[PDB]
Amino acid sequence: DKLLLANWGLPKAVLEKYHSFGVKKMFEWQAECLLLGQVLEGKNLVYSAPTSAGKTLVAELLILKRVLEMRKKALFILPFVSVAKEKKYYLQSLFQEVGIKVDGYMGSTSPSRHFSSLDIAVCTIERANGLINRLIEENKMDLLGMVVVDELHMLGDSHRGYLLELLLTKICYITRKSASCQADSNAVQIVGMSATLPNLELVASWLNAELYHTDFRPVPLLESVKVGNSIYDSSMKLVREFEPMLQVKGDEDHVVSLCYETICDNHSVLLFCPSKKWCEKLADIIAREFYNLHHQASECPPVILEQKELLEVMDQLRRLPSGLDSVLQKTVPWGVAFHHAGLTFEERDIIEGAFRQGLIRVLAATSTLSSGVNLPARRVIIRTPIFGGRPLDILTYKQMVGRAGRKGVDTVGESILICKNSEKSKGIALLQGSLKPVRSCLQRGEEVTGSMIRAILEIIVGGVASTSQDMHTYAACTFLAASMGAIEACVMWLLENEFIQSTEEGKVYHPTHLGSATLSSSLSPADTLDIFADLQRAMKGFVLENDLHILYLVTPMFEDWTTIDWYRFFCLWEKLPTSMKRVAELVGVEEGFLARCVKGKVVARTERQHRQMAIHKRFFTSLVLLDLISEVPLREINQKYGCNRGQIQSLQQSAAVYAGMITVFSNRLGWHNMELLLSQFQKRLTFGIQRELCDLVRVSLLNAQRARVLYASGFHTVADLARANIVEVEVILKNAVPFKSARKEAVEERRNMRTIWVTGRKGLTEREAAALIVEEARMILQQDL
Ligand SMILES: Nc1ncnc2c1ncn2[C@@H]1O[C@H](COP(=O)(O)OP(=O)(O)NP(=O)(O)O)[C@@H](O)[C@H]1O
Ligand SMILES: [K+]
Ligand SMILES: [Mg+2]
């Protein structure tokens, strides 16, 4: 009818891309969300819908609208780097045919093309907030046409979610300062979306946006809870008396039986488990039982139509900086796998693709995946309502059970929450539970608050708020004031700590050098005080014989990245060379405190002055980072310190970004000598390499491992690599592969095996990759001239 996608004036290049797989007609709620109101005119919109209902199409049609009609640039903001990268490639594939340049601002990644020569920028929260501030410093704010926010419910409380408010308030503040222009239409449109929030109307009013809400969902979700053999619904009514056709020993809350039942019916199952260790243990059991039950009585997958793709998955894992996991090597041949934060992001990209293609039918995951990328399944099983020793959060629950039901595939989506008689009441609480109202995170015996101090600093230093009148005008645009002193307290704080200047033109506020430095560094004003002192302390007495002391200055300690074994730490302390003990003493690492940690598990940290704990945690971390840029194997670092490869990769990408911040901060203060030393560690922390490999790693396909083996074989630079014979590069790459046996038959059937993974990847052969490396090296060599 009228909701036919071809009747919406869709460009042919995009219309076919939509018709490429499904997407011929729209939903009832999608048509009402666009037409009703002035949404297509330029009015802001805040809409909510259940997961897997088609929230993406609404935004896509609006973005494609403004970009092509108004010829302005769009901003897409996503919570995590993984979902941001996924969204980039998904939007690129649709719009590359219409000459629409789409790049991304994610974590440490930087766009090759300037923002001025783009159309759609995909960002995380941190990078988006920074880009906005960049446009303010350059006054090129007129470029921005609209901002799209995914998961608008992260506005309440998160590690970086509060920045979403400061970002939006900043947009609402600038457009209000332009409302006093008295002219004589569209400006900057804000499209926000989330899950069903109780105070969603409050959010739409704050942004002066039209509201929309629906409960529509193409596949019905059957939320249930299992106690023993019986399965009940949300009203405690029995919906199924489960009886295992076959039975095995073990814990067995019919967990294997439920999964086996699902696979036999040609479906797939997601199994959520509390700890990282349970996922691997359970994935091993299920795969083992799947072998016994099928034949009625760590190898290769059976010869089927999917044998090649199963082998490619196992081979791609092997040729990764992580190698092929021992448990995965056993389970994956039988469509079983696990998924947690312990794996590297590259391993998880493989498994999700495997599960999405049907190669993996059973996936035992953690709560990390529930908030990650889009990955649906027929049945979702939650092993227990007790996660991490604490009862499961309501938001986590709705994110898990929301992945039950594949649109266009399954008739229903089933959700089972396994409980006992004791925790029976807590399970029902989750099924009937609903999301809590979104807090402002700028709430006030705390007249001053971090989020506010940062918010006030950004508008003054940026030069969009000078007087005292501008400050309270900004206070009106906040989400905190939307629900209907503290502002004045934050301004004085910025004055007391040399962040801002006051010139009595009565009462006008200007940025200091320390102010302008903090803004350019994307640093929090609360953290900047200790960082500024730490740097001044380091410049009074600095160790240069090793790279440890420099690394300490760029070692992040705002969050715990692992659980440190203190006994292990003290063992490394004694074996620690004298040159590195000097750095420890010079920082604050006292041997006495290390002894009181191993002897007694007293965390203390109740006193604020107990940043003494953070110091030892920070020095422990710098040691890990030291070995990391010394090209020490991940397995050695794992055994030496007691942390998995997942925690390490999350740390280095965090330290790579942080290292860049401290470098900028030092540059804006005129500290050249300090800047000079730090400016080489951002690149080394990223790839985990030494100075020699810095030139090789410019090539996209070359990481730490591939760069070293090519260096040790005669290829030291890109220039040397452009002259390279392709088949020689291929051979050197083949030598870098990790095998359990001391490897490094003739199989000429593996000449087409795609065993090398990339980002936004087609499977690459070891030959094709080598030719790409030499081809890219030549293109770079020419751009170097
Ligand atoms: N208008 C539509 N027409 C046909 N199929 C659609 C439409 N919208 C979504 N889909 C299907 O849903 C799939 C993707 O899931 P989607 O509906 O986009 O979930 P979402 O709500 O946008 N994301 P999220 O809830 O955050 O996980 C698409 O690939 C389609 O198969
Ligand atoms: K690279
Ligand atoms: Mg969405």
mmCIF file with all atom_site columns, N, CA and C in Angstrom, residues 379-409:
data_model
loop_
_atom_site.group_PDB
_atom_site.id
_atom_site.type_symbol
_atom_site.label_atom_id
_atom_site.label_alt_id
_atom_site.label_comp_id
_atom_site.label_asym_id
_atom_site.label_entity_id
_atom_site.label_seq_id
_atom_site.pdbx_PDB_ins_code
_atom_site.Cartn_x
_atom_site.Cartn_y
_atom_site.Cartn_z
_atom_site.occupancy
_atom_site.B_iso_or_equiv
_atom_site.pdbx_formal_charge
_atom_site.auth_seq_id
_atom_site.auth_comp_id
_atom_site.auth_asym_id
_atom_site.auth_atom_id
_atom_site.pdbx_PDB_model_num
ATOM 1  N N  . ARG A 1 379 ? 16.127 -19.768 20.908 1.00 0.00 ? 379 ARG A N  1
ATOM 2  C CA . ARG A 1 379 ? 15.940 -19.925 22.344 1.00 0.00 ? 379 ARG A CA 1
ATOM 3  C C  . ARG A 1 379 ? 17.065 -19.271 23.137 1.00 0.00 ? 379 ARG A C  1
ATOM 4  N N  . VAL A 1 380 ? 16.694 -18.534 24.177 1.00 0.00 ? 380 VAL A N  1
ATOM 5  C CA . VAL A 1 380 ? 17.669 -17.954 25.091 1.00 0.00 ? 380 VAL A CA 1
ATOM 6  C C  . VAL A 1 380 ? 17.536 -18.599 26.465 1.00 0.00 ? 380 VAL A C  1
ATOM 7  N N  . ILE A 1 381 ? 18.652 -19.081 27.001 1.00 0.00 ? 381 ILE A N  1
ATOM 8  C CA . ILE A 1 381 ? 18.651 -19.704 28.317 1.00 0.00 ? 381 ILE A CA 1
ATOM 9  C C  . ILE A 1 381 ? 19.551 -18.941 29.281 1.00 0.00 ? 381 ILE A C  1
ATOM 10 N N  . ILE A 1 382 ? 19.005 -18.601 30.442 1.00 0.00 ? 382 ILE A N  1
ATOM 11 C CA . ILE A 1 382 ? 19.778 -17.950 31.490 1.00 0.00 ? 382 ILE A CA 1
ATOM 12 C C  . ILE A 1 382 ? 19.996 -18.939 32.629 1.00 0.00 ? 382 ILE A C  1
ATOM 13 N N  . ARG A 1 383 ? 21.256 -19.271 32.887 1.00 0.00 ? 383 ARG A N  1
ATOM 14 C CA . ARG A 1 383 ? 21.600 -20.353 33.806 1.00 0.00 ? 383 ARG A CA 1
ATOM 15 C C  . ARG A 1 383 ? 21.147 -20.076 35.237 1.00 0.00 ? 383 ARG A C  1
ATOM 16 N N  . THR A 1 384 ? 21.166 -18.809 35.635 1.00 0.00 ? 384 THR A N  1
ATOM 17 C CA . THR A 1 384 ? 20.792 -18.432 36.996 1.00 0.00 ? 384 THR A CA 1
ATOM 18 C C  . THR A 1 384 ? 20.496 -16.936 37.095 1.00 0.00 ? 384 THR A C  1
ATOM 19 N N  . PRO A 1 385 ? 19.578 -16.554 37.996 1.00 0.00 ? 385 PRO A N  1
ATOM 20 C CA . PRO A 1 385 ? 19.295 -15.133 38.226 1.00 0.00 ? 385 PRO A CA 1
ATOM 21 C C  . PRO A 1 385 ? 20.326 -14.456 39.130 1.00 0.00 ? 385 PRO A C  1
ATOM 22 N N  . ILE A 1 386 ? 21.405 -15.162 39.453 1.00 0.00 ? 386 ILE A N  1
ATOM 23 C CA . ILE A 1 386 ? 22.462 -14.608 40.294 1.00 0.00 ? 386 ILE A CA 1
ATOM 24 C C  . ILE A 1 386 ? 23.762 -14.436 39.510 1.00 0.00 ? 386 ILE A C  1
ATOM 25 N N  . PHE A 1 387 ? 24.031 -13.206 39.081 1.00 0.00 ? 387 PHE A N  1
ATOM 26 C CA . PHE A 1 387 ? 25.216 -12.903 38.286 1.00 0.00 ? 387 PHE A CA 1
ATOM 27 C C  . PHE A 1 387 ? 26.287 -12.184 39.102 1.00 0.00 ? 387 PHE A C  1
ATOM 28 N N  . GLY A 1 388 ? 27.462 -12.800 39.200 1.00 0.00 ? 388 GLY A N  1
ATOM 29 C CA . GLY A 1 388 ? 28.577 -12.213 39.922 1.00 0.00 ? 388 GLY A CA 1
ATOM 30 C C  . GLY A 1 388 ? 28.375 -12.193 41.426 1.00 0.00 ? 388 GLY A C  1
ATOM 31 N N  . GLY A 1 389 ? 27.554 -13.113 41.923 1.00 0.00 ? 389 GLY A N  1
ATOM 32 C CA . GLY A 1 389 ? 27.263 -13.190 43.344 1.00 0.00 ? 389 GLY A CA 1
ATOM 33 C C  . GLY A 1 389 ? 26.142 -12.253 43.751 1.00 0.00 ? 389 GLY A C  1
ATOM 34 N N  . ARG A 1 390 ? 25.656 -11.475 42.790 1.00 0.00 ? 390 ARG A N  1
ATOM 35 C CA . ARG A 1 390 ? 24.576 -10.527 43.025 1.00 0.00 ? 390 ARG A CA 1
ATOM 36 C C  . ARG A 1 390 ? 23.393 -10.832 42.108 1.00 0.00 ? 390 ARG A C  1
ATOM 37 N N  . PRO A 1 391 ? 22.172 -10.461 42.532 1.00 0.00 ? 391 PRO A N  1
ATOM 38 C CA . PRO A 1 391 ? 20.994 -10.671 41.683 1.00 0.00 ? 391 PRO A CA 1
ATOM 39 C C  . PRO A 1 391 ? 21.106 -9.920  40.359 1.00 0.00 ? 391 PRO A C  1
ATOM 40 N N  . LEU A 1 392 ? 20.584 -10.520 39.296 1.00 0.00 ? 392 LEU A N  1
ATOM 41 C CA . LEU A 1 392 ? 20.700 -9.967  37.952 1.00 0.00 ? 392 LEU A CA 1
ATOM 42 C C  . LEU A 1 392 ? 19.954 -8.641  37.806 1.00 0.00 ? 392 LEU A C  1
ATOM 43 N N  . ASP A 1 393 ? 20.611 -7.667  37.184 1.00 0.00 ? 393 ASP A N  1
ATOM 44 C CA . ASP A 1 393 ? 19.999 -6.370  36.912 1.00 0.00 ? 393 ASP A CA 1
ATOM 45 C C  . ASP A 1 393 ? 18.858 -6.519  35.910 1.00 0.00 ? 393 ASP A C  1
ATOM 46 N N  . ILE A 1 394 ? 17.829 -5.689  36.056 1.00 0.00 ? 394 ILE A N  1
ATOM 47 C CA . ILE A 1 394 ? 16.661 -5.760  35.183 1.00 0.00 ? 394 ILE A CA 1
ATOM 48 C C  . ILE A 1 394 ? 17.017 -5.402  33.734 1.00 0.00 ? 394 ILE A C  1
ATOM 49 N N  . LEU A 1 395 ? 17.890 -4.413  33.556 1.00 0.00 ? 395 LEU A N  1
ATOM 50 C CA . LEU A 1 395 ? 18.299 -3.985  32.220 1.00 0.00 ? 395 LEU A CA 1
ATOM 51 C C  . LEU A 1 395 ? 19.075 -5.079  31.491 1.00 0.00 ? 395 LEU A C  1
ATOM 52 N N  . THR A 1 396 ? 19.913 -5.801  32.227 1.00 0.00 ? 396 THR A N  1
ATOM 53 C CA . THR A 1 396 ? 20.677 -6.897  31.648 1.00 0.00 ? 396 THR A CA 1
ATOM 54 C C  . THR A 1 396 ? 19.737 -8.016  31.203 1.00 0.00 ? 396 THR A C  1
ATOM 55 N N  . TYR A 1 397 ? 18.702 -8.262  31.999 1.00 0.00 ? 397 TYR A N  1
ATOM 56 C CA . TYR A 1 397 ? 17.739 -9.314  31.701 1.00 0.00 ? 397 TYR A CA 1
ATOM 57 C C  . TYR A 1 397 ? 16.974 -9.036  30.406 1.00 0.00 ? 397 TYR A C  1
ATOM 58 N N  . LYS A 1 398 ? 16.490 -7.807  30.250 1.00 0.00 ? 398 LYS A N  1
ATOM 59 C CA . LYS A 1 398 ? 15.715 -7.444  29.067 1.00 0.00 ? 398 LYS A CA 1
ATOM 60 C C  . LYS A 1 398 ? 16.577 -7.438  27.806 1.00 0.00 ? 398 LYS A C  1
ATOM 61 N N  . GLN A 1 399 ? 17.883 -7.260  27.977 1.00 0.00 ? 399 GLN A N  1
ATOM 62 C CA . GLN A 1 399 ? 18.805 -7.270  26.847 1.00 0.00 ? 399 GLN A CA 1
ATOM 63 C C  . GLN A 1 399 ? 19.130 -8.697  26.414 1.00 0.00 ? 399 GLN A C  1
ATOM 64 N N  . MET A 1 400 ? 19.076 -9.625  27.363 1.00 0.00 ? 400 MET A N  1
ATOM 65 C CA . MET A 1 400 ? 19.316 -11.033 27.075 1.00 0.00 ? 400 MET A CA 1
ATOM 66 C C  . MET A 1 400 ? 18.110 -11.673 26.397 1.00 0.00 ? 400 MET A C  1
ATOM 67 N N  . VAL A 1 401 ? 16.938 -11.526 27.011 1.00 0.00 ? 401 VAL A N  1
ATOM 68 C CA . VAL A 1 401 ? 15.717 -12.137 26.495 1.00 0.00 ? 401 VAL A CA 1
ATOM 69 C C  . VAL A 1 401 ? 15.221 -11.447 25.228 1.00 0.00 ? 401 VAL A C  1
ATOM 70 N N  . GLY A 1 402 ? 15.765 -10.270 24.944 1.00 0.00 ? 402 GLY A N  1
ATOM 71 C CA . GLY A 1 402 ? 15.392 -9.538  23.751 1.00 0.00 ? 402 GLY A CA 1
ATOM 72 C C  . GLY A 1 402 ? 16.007 -10.130 22.497 1.00 0.00 ? 402 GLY A C  1
ATOM 73 N N  . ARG A 1 403 ? 17.044 -10.943 22.678 1.00 0.00 ? 403 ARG A N  1
ATOM 74 C CA . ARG A 1 403 ? 17.731 -11.573 21.556 1.00 0.00 ? 403 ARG A CA 1
ATOM 75 C C  . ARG A 1 403 ? 17.089 -12.906 21.185 1.00 0.00 ? 403 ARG A C  1
ATOM 76 N N  . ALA A 1 404 ? 15.914 -13.165 21.746 1.00 0.00 ? 404 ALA A N  1
ATOM 77 C CA . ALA A 1 404 ? 15.153 -14.363 21.415 1.00 0.00 ? 404 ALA A CA 1
ATOM 78 C C  . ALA A 1 404 ? 14.130 -14.056 20.330 1.00 0.00 ? 404 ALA A C  1
ATOM 79 N N  . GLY A 1 405 ? 14.303 -14.668 19.164 1.00 0.00 ? 405 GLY A N  1
ATOM 80 C CA . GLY A 1 405 ? 13.391 -14.459 18.056 1.00 0.00 ? 405 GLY A CA 1
ATOM 81 C C  . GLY A 1 405 ? 14.049 -13.756 16.886 1.00 0.00 ? 405 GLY A C  1
ATOM 82 N N  . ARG A 1 406 ? 14.310 -14.514 15.828 1.00 0.00 ? 406 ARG A N  1
ATOM 83 C CA . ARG A 1 406 ? 14.921 -13.972 14.624 1.00 0.00 ? 406 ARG A CA 1
ATOM 84 C C  . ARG A 1 406 ? 13.848 -13.489 13.657 1.00 0.00 ? 406 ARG A C  1
ATOM 85 N N  . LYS A 1 407 ? 13.869 -12.195 13.348 1.00 0.00 ? 407 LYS A N  1
ATOM 86 C CA . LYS A 1 407 ? 12.872 -11.601 12.466 1.00 0.00 ? 407 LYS A CA 1
ATOM 87 C C  . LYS A 1 407 ? 12.931 -12.208 11.066 1.00 0.00 ? 407 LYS A C  1
ATOM 88 N N  . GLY A 1 408 ? 11.825 -12.815 10.647 1.00 0.00 ? 408 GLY A N  1
ATOM 89 C CA . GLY A 1 408 ? 11.730 -13.415 9.329  1.00 0.00 ? 408 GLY A CA 1
ATOM 90 C C  . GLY A 1 408 ? 12.140 -14.876 9.286  1.00 0.00 ? 408 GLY A C  1
ATOM 91 N N  . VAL A 1 409 ? 12.498 -15.432 10.440 1.00 0.00 ? 409 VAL A N  1
ATOM 92 C CA . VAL A 1 409 ? 12.972 -16.811 10.509 1.00 0.00 ? 409 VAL A CA 1
ATOM 93 C C  . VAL A 1 409 ? 12.166 -17.658 11.493 1.00 0.00 ? 409 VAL A C  1
#
